[PDB]
Design a protein around this ligand. Structure first.
Ligand SMILES: CN1CCN(C(=O)[C@H]2[C@@H](C(=O)O)[C@@H]3CC[C@H]2O3)CC1
Ligand SMILES: [Mn+2]
Ligand SMILES: [Mn+2]
Length: 320
């Protein structure tokens, strides 16, 4: 006996569609991806991500489509449910996952390695944007670091941290829709140029554009406020509108907050929240949603969904 009982294996070190199907099934059955394959996925996706701009600029032709998902937080069985409701990722069914893949939920390893696998398989049609939880300080507290150390080793966690540093911070579709995890900026006048200029391969600063992209929240009233989170700001509809007008944009899609209906349309339609972790932490009872967009019609169409069963591992079981 050697590795016959160790599960899915890459094909000469590369991700294939049959590997991804084997992986999702193996994870569904609560089994672990061989550490050598996990390592190969991480080294390769680090290389892919490190060549991207901090701002991914994507063009959708008139009849092309894309799906935008918000926070998933290690709810792997809900992630599979997204793919069963909305189809597997492919070149004709592209996806954007808008940050916060890990922490809180206790299948964060399974979520993130599935997402990285699909990033390697469909690199121009499967997009991952950094959330505030793809950071060391958050992983240390909120489960992911403990989960990686439990399933693999501290060295594997170090590699995850390095890979997260190369996740892009925002994505712009057709020069019209800007997507980021958190939101807009603590000062006026920021442009797409400034986002492209962020040297993102780091942990986020305590303030400034990289912080805001991962951490800010919309508020209903005009202006800005100190964030209730102690980090970044809250930004009003006039902030959103000035930013969109200066940058020739129509609206933003962000995530980073739970909503009972899975989404919220705010700022007169200019600031949309999408959140894709239903019954968050097995307690919130929220619906989740994902957004459908078309190249010829970038209006957001929302699809709601509810949580599905998962194995009996508690949320935050690996947290501090
Ligand atoms: C953390 O993360 C929390 C927020 C951020 O993001 C949202 C709402 C719940 C969870 O996701
Ligand atoms: Mn979150
Ligand atoms: Mn967040």
């Amino acid at each position: 006996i050697e590795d016959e009982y160790s599960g899915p294996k890459l094909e000469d070190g590369k991700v294939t569609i049959s590997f991804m199907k084997e992986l999702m099934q193996w994870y569904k059955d609560q089994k672990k991806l061989h550490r050598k394959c996990a390592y190969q996925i991480l080294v390769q996706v680090k290389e892919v991500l490190s060549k991207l701009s901090t701002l991914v600029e994507t063009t959708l032709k008139e009849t092309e489509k894309i799906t935008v998902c918000g926070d998933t937080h290690g709810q792997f069985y809900d992630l599979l449910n997204i793919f069963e409701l909305n189809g597997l990722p492919s070149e004709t069914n592209p996806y954007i996952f808008n940050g916060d893949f890990v922490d809180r939920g206790s299948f964060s390893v399974e979520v993130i390695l599935t997402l990285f696998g699909f990033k390697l398989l469909y690199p121009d049609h499967f997009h991952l944007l950094r959330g505030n939880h793809e950071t060391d300080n958050m992983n240390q507290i909120y489960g992911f670091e403990g989960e990686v150390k439990a399933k693999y080793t501290a060295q594997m966690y170090e590699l995850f941290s390095e890979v997260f540093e190369w996740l892009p911070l925002a994505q712009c579709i057709n020069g019209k829709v800007l997507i980021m995890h958190g939101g807009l900026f603590s000062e006026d006048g920021v442009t797409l140029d400034d986002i492209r200029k962020i040297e993102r391969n780091r942990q986020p600063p305590d303030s400034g554009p990289m912080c805001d992209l991962l951490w800010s929240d919309p508020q209903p009233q005009n202006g800005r406020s100190i964030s209730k989170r102690g980090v970044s700001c809250q930004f009003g509809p006039d902030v959103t509108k000035a930013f969109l007008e200066e940058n020739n944009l129509d609206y933003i899609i962000r995530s980073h907050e739970v909503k009972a209906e899975g989404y919220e349309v705010a700022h007169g339609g200019r600031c949309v929240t999408v959140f894709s972790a239903p019954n968050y932490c097995d307690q919130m009872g929220n619906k989740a949603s994902y957004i459908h967009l078309q190249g010829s019609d970038l209006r957001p169409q929302f699809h709601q969904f509810t949580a599905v069963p998962h194995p009996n591992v508690k949320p935050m079981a690996y947290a501090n």
